[PDB]
Design goal:
Elements: H1 14-20, H2 24-31, H3 37-46, H4 50-63, H5 67-75, H6 78-84, H7 91-107, H8 111-117, H9 120-126, H10 133-147, H11 151-159, H12 162-172, H13 176-189, H14 195-201, H15 204-209, H16 217-231, H17 241-250, H18 256-270, H19 274-282, H20 285-296, H21 300-313, H22 320-329, H23 333-338, H24 346-359, H25 366-371, H26 374-389, H27 396-410, H28 414-422, H29 426-432, H30 438-451, H31 455-463, H32 467-473, H33 479-491
């Protein structure tokens, strides 16, 4: 435990320091002392001889294995030095630098702030165009460590072009450890409102889709979690066919986290996207989602997104009618009505009411929905929800609008109209005409319009004093409201 000096024009000093760092005995003596540790750093940070830099970086690396060696480099200002070396043209130096930084980030307290201040994030993002996978795996892990729970770092990663670079890695490499660490960076970034659209624009959804049948469960699951974050209100994408097919297959997985994510992504991607609705139906998505709901039982983390996806798939696309029938044909009607009952919570009830509204568009579903008891439960929901509004999550006004809307469609059928009227709903429907909410006025006037095609019901509506509020509604700025109001008035 002796030498501690050195001088300009000589680097045989470093070439002797290094070997001592291999032997733990001498290694503890050199790191217990803040003497030449600082004198190691200056060398590395300054010289233009390539072999001294790697000898210097190599030494710092060997010291990073011990709690005090980390402290040594840290207190000695090794972090800005190490970050500077991330610009080195020697692969061996780059590798020592990122690895030492990695060790500091893992164990040394204060290292993360120190790396951020030193401009580490920008340098690490810039290194994502390198081609060595073990190097990329360390680099992306440093980024995960620095980005997690740190919004500031996330925005810097975005500004530096992180999303495209990470997406390119997922589209390029097969090395599992690298794909997994890169997916964890994307997962962290995917909850940032700025990073999310950037990742989508980079083609991140399609890229993550590539890995959904990888043998590595941790890789699949991270891709799924990230996809669920990204898919929520994304721009319309091309080349989604493969991803959509795989998600439908994943619904049948024995892993509940896989099923939950698959349903949620399918829900997100099908919302108002008729192209995606079509593709999903074409690969048997209705059957798969119904099976998923049936198997899920009272697990609302699965049923809620699955029912939302079914709601999307049963509306407003070329095969919507086929889908409406398919829910019935795959034995789905009884469970859908069941989900309107306790123990279902409000989000699930809201989604289920919406699905039933779409299913009722299909005449062949009118009788089975009635037989399964959809009508009285929808009425009870509506009555209680209306009372609640008149006295954060789901607003009861949404349940009022939803149930009335479902009853509006079910009322196309003559037997359903008899049941609906038989439940003393006309007085409530008329009171809903007075609602502040145009959407509620609309379905209320709509259901009254269906009911009023039968003479006996037309008289009951008139007797309920509907004429006055309907006349007010003739002048509604909402053309749908005005049209239904005019139609009820006519039938009376």
């Amino acid at each position: 435990l002796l030498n501690d000096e050195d001088q300009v024009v000589v680097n045989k000093a470093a070439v002797m320091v290094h070997q001592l760092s291999k032997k733990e005995a001498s290694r503890h003596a050199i790191m217990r002392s803040p003497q030449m540790v600082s004198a190691i750093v200056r060398t590395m940070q300054n010289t233009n001889d390539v072999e001294t830099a790697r000898c210097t970086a190599g030494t710092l690396h060997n010291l990073s294995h011990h709690r005090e060696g980390l402290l040594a480099i840290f207190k000695s200002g090794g972090i800005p030095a190490l970050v500077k070396m991330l610009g080195s043209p020697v692969d061996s130096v780059l590798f020592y630098a990122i690895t030492t930084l990695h060790n500091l980030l893992l164990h040394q307290e204060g290292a993360k702030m120190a790396v951020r201040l030193a401009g580490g994030l920008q340098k690490m993002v810039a290194l994502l165009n390198k081609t060595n996978v073990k190097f990329l795996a360390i680099t992306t892990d440093c980024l995960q460590i620095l980005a997690y729970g740190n919004q500031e770092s996330k925005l810097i990663i975005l500004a530096s072009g992180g999303p495209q670079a990470l997406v390119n890695i997922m589209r390029t490499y097969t090395y599992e450890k690298l794909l997994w660490t890169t997916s964890r960076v994307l997962k962290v970034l995917s909850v940032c409102s700025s990073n999310k659209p950037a990742i989508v624009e980079a083609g991140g959804m399609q890229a993550l889709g590539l890995h959904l049948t990888d043998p590595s469960q941790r890789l699949v699951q991270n891709c799924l979690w990230t996809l669920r974050n990204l898919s929520d209100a994304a721009t319309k994408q091309e080349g989604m066919e493969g991803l959509l097919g795989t998600l439908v297959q994943l619904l049948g997985s024995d892993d509940i986290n896989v099923v939950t994510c698959a349903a949620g992504i399918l829900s997100n991607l099908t919302c108002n996207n008729y192209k995606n609705k079509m593709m999903v139906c074409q690969v048997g998505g209705i059957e798969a989602l119904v099976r998923t709901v049936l198997r899920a039982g009272d697990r609302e983390d699965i049923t809620e997104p699955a029912i939302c996806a079914l709601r999307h798939l049963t509306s407003r696309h070329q095969e919507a009618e086929m889908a409406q029938n398919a829910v019935r044909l795959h034995y789905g009607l009884p469970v859908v009505v069941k989900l309107l009952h306790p123990p279902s919570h409000w989000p699930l009830i809201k989604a289920t009411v919406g699905l039933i509204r779409n299913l009722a568009l299909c005449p062949a579903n009118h009788a089975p929905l009635r037989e399964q008891g959809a009508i009285p439960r929808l009425v009870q929901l509506l009555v209680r929800a209306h009372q609640d509004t008149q006295r954060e999550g789901v607003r009861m006004e949404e349940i009022v609008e939803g149930c009335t809307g479902a009853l509006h469609i079910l009322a196309r059928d003559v037997h359903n109209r008899i049941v609906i009227r038989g439940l003393n709903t006309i007085p409530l429907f008329v009171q809903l005409l007075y609602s502040p909410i145009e959407n509620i006025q609309r379905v209320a006037a709509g259901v009254l319009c269906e009911l009023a095609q039968d003479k006996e019901a037309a008289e009951a509506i008139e007797a309920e004093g509907a004429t006055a509020p309907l006349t007010e509604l003739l002048h509604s700025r909402n053309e749908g409201v005005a049209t239904y109001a005019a139609a009820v008035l006519f039938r009376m």
